[PDB]
Design a protein around this ligand. Sequence first.
Ligand SMILES: *[C@H]1O[C@H](CO)[C@@H](O[C@@H]2O[C@H](CO)[C@@H](O)[C@H](O)[C@H]2NC(C)=O)[C@H](O)[C@H]1NC(C)=O
Ligand SMILES: *[C@H]1O[C@H](CO)[C@@H](O[C@@H]2O[C@H](CO)[C@@H](O)[C@H](O)[C@H]2NC(C)=O)[C@H](O)[C@H]1NC(C)=O
Ligand SMILES: [Cu+2]
Lengths: 329, 329
Amino acid sequence: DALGTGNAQKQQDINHLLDKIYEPTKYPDLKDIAENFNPLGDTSIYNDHGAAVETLMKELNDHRLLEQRHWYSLFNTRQRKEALMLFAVLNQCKEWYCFRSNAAYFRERMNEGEFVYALYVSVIHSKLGDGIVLPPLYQITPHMFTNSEVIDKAYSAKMTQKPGTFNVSFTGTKKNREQRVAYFGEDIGMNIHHVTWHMDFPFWWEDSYGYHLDRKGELFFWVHHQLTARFDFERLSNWLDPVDELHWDRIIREGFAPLTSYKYGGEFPVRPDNIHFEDVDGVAHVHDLEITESRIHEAIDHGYITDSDGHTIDIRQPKGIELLGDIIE
Amino acid sequence: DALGTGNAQKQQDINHLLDKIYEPTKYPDLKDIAENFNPLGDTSIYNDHGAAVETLMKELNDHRLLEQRHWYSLFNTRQRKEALMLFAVLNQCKEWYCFRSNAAYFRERMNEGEFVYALYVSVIHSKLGDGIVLPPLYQITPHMFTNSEVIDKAYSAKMTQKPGTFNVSFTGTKKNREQRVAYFGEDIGMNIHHVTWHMDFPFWWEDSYGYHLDRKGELFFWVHHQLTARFDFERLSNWLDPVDELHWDRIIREGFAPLTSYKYGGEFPVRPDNIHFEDVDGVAHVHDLEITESRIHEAIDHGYITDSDGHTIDIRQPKGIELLGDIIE
Ligand SMILES: *[C@H]1O[C@H](CO)[C@@H](O[C@@H]2O[C@H](CO)[C@@H](O)[C@H](O)[C@H]2NC(C)=O)[C@H](O)[C@H]1NC(C)=O
Ligand SMILES: *[C@H]1O[C@H](CO)[C@@H](O[C@@H]2O[C@H](CO)[C@@H](O)[C@H](O)[C@H]2NC(C)=O)[C@H](O)[C@H]1NC(C)=O
Ligand SMILES: [Cu+2]
């Protein structure tokens, strides 16, 4: 800050914050902040009177938040909850003084993915983040977007201190699969949009956060219909045939080995091909889906979605397809 | 009687009644009653004006009631109906004169299990049975509770008239199974409670019989959750792992051979292990369960049970779990 704004400031601040992210920061201001600040002494910066801050401390305190240098999926109901607590502080800042402070204070003792994930969503949705452009995920946390080989090649570059660029590969045994329409899935661009798309309109949004995203519902319907078409075309251009729809009662015919690795975490598990779906402990039962899919499918077939009271809310009308997306994603 | 009560009377009467039960009685009063009485000549003893008596005679008459010396399960919709007709006579007696009469008259030409079963429930629920303690099932009809070997050993004792006690065994090839947590299932005590529990609050009760059992519903929820925990603990103490929940789409992995025999009836059938469930003629289809289980499971999931009119009766409240038990057992 300029005990405020700029943007080539706001901006600077951000680049510092997501610089070497798997290691304590090297930018000194970020550290005395990191040390000196107390998110709890002038609940005023906070439009909540700092209930959000006060909740994260509580957890950082009982030290019940996920550890640093460990992995993180946004599909973990707790990891998510923790990542999203950071979003609610950064969210209720009146100005840069409260953001930098917090993403500095926190950056330094909350885990990286919760952190990477909170800083981005926050920058994207909060009032205070206008001027900024976020660096591309692919360069901030490259392990999610580069291969496993280039990663190891880069680890060696570093061991030996001799530089240089390595050329990446493509997945399976090209000329042996349908890792022929790979160029599409594996692109750092689509992978970027896919993540952004869902940071722009998150599945977890409540309108307490501030405004309402408009038709995420159709927006969900549509974005995916697009990747599914866009995908189906590439498979056309490759003498391949449109894709199979998946069912829970059948084998997952087509499995792959991703060859990708986590930074802290191990390599991504692989899937053998012609496998039978198993009931996965913790998440949900396979049949649990099969019934979900029917409750779904009956709302489409009935003409109405029925809520909690047994109210039937009609969907044979234009808002239709969006109440369906709210129930389906 | 004392042309009534006592209890060391009521009581006596009962012990006479369930004495050698697979054979006509040897206590003379029980027999001239047995012969001389007519449940139909002083409809007055009866608070029904003897519609109950009058219904059993009707059936004993067309001789359409189950035969004597034959088996009986309480799961047979007719056997049950016949056993429960005895309960409704014994039920509407104004005094001992009507009970002894009937369980004497009947004891002697209705089948034993319908009889054993009616005398007990009747003694347990009817107004007139206060003073009594019932003998333990295990000694009145030992075939349901002792092994097949001890039974045959006792048959020999008898053939030869040389007495004595035999030591019973435990089931499969102990040190070969999970007939290691046998001591629990096979105990004459738990087996006694299990039967009593369901005689105290029967699945067939209507409140016409006289009063309402209070929360059989939660009472059902709970009693079984208890045997299931109590069981799960014993399997802990045996290096065994908590039990598998059963599904209709899977094999019944764990089968057993009971080695038990009926008195009149043959030995209990056995089950081979890793078998596939078959649709059993007469009872119901396997899928018939699979849908039942979903109708169930949707009431839980919806928030309401829906009756016959399509009334939704809410269950997200404290009486909750008991309307669920009324629909589930
Ligand atoms: C990776 O593919 C690139 C294409 O960008 C190759 O880099 C080339 O290096 C060759 C040496 O044979 C030069 O003739 C080209 O001018 C290079 N281009 C940049 C059109 O560097 C590279 O050879 C591949 N392999 C490494 C086996 O980097
Ligand atoms: C059944 O087990 C009992 C344990 O109650 C055994 O009865 C015992 O008989 C032995 C003879 O070896 C005596 O030493 C014990 O005093 C008995 N106890 C009653 C502690 O009788 C019996 O041996 C077993 N078998 C029959 C192979 O009855
Ligand atoms: Cu039971």
